[PDB]
Amino acid sequence: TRDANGTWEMESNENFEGWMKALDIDFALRKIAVRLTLTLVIDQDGDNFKTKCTSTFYNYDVDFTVGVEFDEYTKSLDNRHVKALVTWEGDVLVCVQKGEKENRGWKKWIEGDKLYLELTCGDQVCRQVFKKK
Numbered sequence: 001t002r003d004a005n006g007t008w009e010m011e012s013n014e015n016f017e018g019w020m021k022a023l024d025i026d027f028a029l030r031k032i033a034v035r036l037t038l039t040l041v042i043d044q045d046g047d048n049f050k051t052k053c054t055s056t057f058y059n060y061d062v063d064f065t066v067g068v069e070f071d072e073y074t075k076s077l078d079n080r081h082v083k084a085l086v087t088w089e090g091d092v093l094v095c096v097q098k099g100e101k102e103n104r105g106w107k108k109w110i111e112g113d114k115l116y117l118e119l120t121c122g123d124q125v126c127r128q129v130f131k132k133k
């Protein structure tokens, strides 16, 4: 479905460390991020999205409109300027982040009460699965 609204609880998270390493996240902070529980909250109304990723020590919040390029500064992650764009490819929500890193972005598949997320940077892919709370 194209409806990603909800509070999403993590079920699985594969190659999180390799993806963070591809983004040049500090080794020390990688070890903490691997242990912290992540909650993904999405509010979606038509084209307008508000995404909030929350843990004990780190938060990542982004708002965007589908189809409208936006300047992004990943201040709480790798601290880079990218040109971001989120679009629908069938029922897949696709985000491309143009900048220094190649193949940078994510894709989201909503299958019922499950959300599959693949985050990419360089030759690394992190695969996450969430269940709607």
Ligand SMILES: *C/C=C/c1ccc2c(c1)C(C)(C)c1cc(N(CC)CC)ccc1-2
Binding pocket: 020, 033, 038, 040, 051, 053, 054, 055, 058, 059, 060, 077, 106, 108, 117, 119
């Ligand atoms: C559709 C999902 C997009 C998206 C963008 C940014 C982040 C995420 C998802 C998370 C939840 C995977 C995430 C986690 C983190 N930290 C760990 C590296 C913890 C907050 C940062 C950014 C994003």
